[PDB]
Design a protein around this ligand. Structure first.
Ligand SMILES: Cc1n[nH]c(C)c1-c1c(-c2cccc(OC(C)C)c2)n(CCC(=O)O)c2ccc(C3CC3)cc12
Length: 136
């Protein structure tokens, strides 16, 4: 019950830049209207740890959601775009790797600290979106 290295992710984060998000979304299969409304949002992301359980929440004009999970242990997740997926989050040397699977597809969201930023890379097949957060 002392420090985690994940206690580098802990806190409150605000989105400060987005690249290629619409394309990432299209590749995922997100509908037009949802893409438009989601891409406008400037969420905060709140990350906390309590023993082995990591919680990530979004505070967003698009959708307020939360996930709680244990590294390496699969869980059910209903995404903001209303996909029902099976997810697993692991820590691969400093990077939090979030894999979502549904209908024989998958997408990977990687989150890592760089300088004072938390960089989120969303990947679907060959399309990558980079979403950059700073401390709130
Ligand atoms: C849950 C939510 N509310 N408002 C936004 C924006 C989102 C959203 C998040 C997000 C942002 C902050 C925290 C967060 O936490 C959850 C893991 C609880 C998710 N991600 C993850 C990648 C990112 O940080 O933008 C998304 C990836 C794709 C999509 C589009 C609909 C398909 C939306 C999001």
């Amino acid at each position: 019950r002392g420090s985690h290295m994940c206690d580098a992710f802990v806190g409150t984060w605000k989105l400060v830049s987005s690249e290629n998000f619409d394309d990432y979304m299209k590749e995922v299969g997100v509908g037009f209207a949802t893409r438009k409304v989601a891409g406008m949002a400037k969420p905060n992301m709140i990350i906390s740890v309590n023993g082995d359980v990591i919680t990530i929440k979004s505070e967003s004009t698009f959708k307020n959601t939360e996930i709680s999970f244990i590294l390496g242990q699969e869980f059910d997740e209903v995404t903001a775009d209303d996909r029902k997926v099976k997810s697993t989050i692991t820590l691969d040397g400093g990077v939090l790797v979030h894999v979502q699977k549904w209908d024989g597809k998958s997408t990977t969201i990687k989150r890592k600290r760089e300088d004072d930023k938390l960089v989120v890379e969303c990947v679907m097949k060959g399309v990558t979106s980079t979403r950059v957060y700073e401390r709130a």
